[PDB]
Design a protein around this ligand. Structure first.
Ligand code: P4P
Lengths: 110, 110
């Protein structure tokens, strides 16, 4: 795999998984439930493979924060698309997170 | 039960889980790896108990502020690393980002 394509897959898995679990309200359908756990385990594996390459606690927090803001922003657009302050600030936060991951990566000896 | 104590325990379970996940070094240590799975699942369960008494964004704001300091202290303590300039800005972004998004976000329709 490519580590950024795999990261995009992990972001996609987080978006689908949170939404699917929210709709399900628990484990309802067995194949969705097992598949959701497997997609999260595959996503978690990428963090374990990237353990020393970037500082773990800050990296997880930035990825998680970007993820829930992205999930909320996608849900907000589904409710109705607004050029409003939380959506604008959410995009700025995601852009700052992407920039901060580069800065964390380049302040970590490769 | 006491929900404030449960939330503190839920955060502690994540911080210990993340500490075990770093200690496990790419899944090489078997017994911390087994403990890691249990600690995150326990954190999720304690969080599930919490989110019947403290709302999701309110809980996330507390989790974001309290938890980062605790894992950072352990990160210096056992893994010998210091927060550099972009990591400090990242911590500021995590701390203030939840508050501004939660303040300016608009209510769910359903
Ligand atoms: C397990 C179950 C729920 C959460 P989260 C959350 C999900 C994704 C990214 C960031 C946060 C949540 C999301 C939507 C509905 C309910 C719960 C979560 C974590 C800590 C504190 C509050 C909320 C976390 C782990």
């Amino acid at each position: 795999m490519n580590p950024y394509i795999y990261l995009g897959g992990a972001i996609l898995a987080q978006v689908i998984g949170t939404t699917l679990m929210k709709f399900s309200e628990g484990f309802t359908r067995l194949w969705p439930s097992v598949g959701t756990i497997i997609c999260y385990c595959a996503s978690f594996w990428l963090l374990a493979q990237t353990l020393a390459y970037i500082p773990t606690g800050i990296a997880y927090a930035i990825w998680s924060g970007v993820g829930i803001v992205l999930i909320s922003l996608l849900s907000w657009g589904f409710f109705g698309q607004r050029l409003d302050l939380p959506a604008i600030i959410g995009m700025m936060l995601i852009c700052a997170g992407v920039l901060i991951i580069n800065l964390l990566s380049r302040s970590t000896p490769h």
